[PDB]
């Protein structure tokens, strides 16, 4: 286990544009297409064709799949490390727990994660049990509680048991 493995687990793989939990166009391994109301599935493939560098008719291949996946995982790191309140816990964290943190950012992004005020303290304070509670107290846990569990368990125990 490690990040890519975790995400590849949480996000799954799908070669044809679909809608995330939010009802957002997503393609591949959690690749987020756009959140604008202006676009439909077909128009969002334009955005795609751009990133992909070719007409895809809203279909990619395992490789392009993997291509953007990488670009995605970076960017979150990129995220974490740009943010004045992320970089601290990240640094505070161990190699596995970081895979937890990042996962979140890959789900809701920079901003939306940093918004986990108390937890981020609590978890930098290295206060696992509490931290893991406060997190379950979220819309997040509410939207995708399954995915939220595994991670929460992750931040709790420190391993990949949850990833079995």
Curated annotation (Swiss-Prot):
Q: Which domain of life is it from?
A: Viruses
Summarize the impact of residue 26 to E: Complete loss of activity at neutral pH; covalently bound substrate
Quote the record's binding site residues for substrate: 32, 106, 119, 134
Q: Which Pfam families match?
A: Phage_lysozyme
Q: What is the effect of changing residue 26 to H?
A: Facilitates transglycosylation more effectively than hydrolysis; covalently bound substrate
This protein's GO CC annotations = host cell cytoplasm
- Give the pH dependence: Optimum pH is 7.3.
Alphabetically, the GO molecular function entries are: lysozyme activity
**What are the inducing conditions?**
Expressed late in the viral replication.
Name of the protein in its database record: Endolysin
What is the taxonomic lineage of the source species? Viruses, Duplodnaviria, Heunggongvirae, Uroviricota, Caudoviricetes
């Amino acid at each position: 286990m490690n990040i890519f493995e975790m995400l590849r687990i949480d996000e799954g793989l799908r070669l044809k544009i679909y809608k995330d939990t939010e009802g957002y166009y997503t393609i591949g391994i959690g690749h987020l297409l756009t959140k604008s109301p202006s676009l439909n599935a077909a128009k969002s493939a334009a955005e795609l064709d751009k990133a992909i560098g070719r007409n895809t008719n809203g279909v990619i291949t395992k490789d392009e799949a993997e291509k953007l996946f990488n670009q995605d995982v970076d960017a979150a790191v990129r995220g974490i490390l740009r943010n004045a309140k992320l970089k601290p816990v990240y640094d505070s964290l161990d190699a596995v727990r970081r895979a937890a943190l990042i996962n979140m950012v890959f789900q809701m992004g920079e901003t939306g994660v940093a918004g986990f005020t108390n937890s981020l303290r609590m978890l930098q304070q290295k206060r696992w049990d509490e931290a893991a509670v406060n997190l379950a107290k979220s819309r997040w846990y509410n939207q995708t509680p399954n995915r939220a569990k595994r991670v929460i368990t992750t931040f709790r125990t420190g391993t990949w048991d949850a990833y079995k």
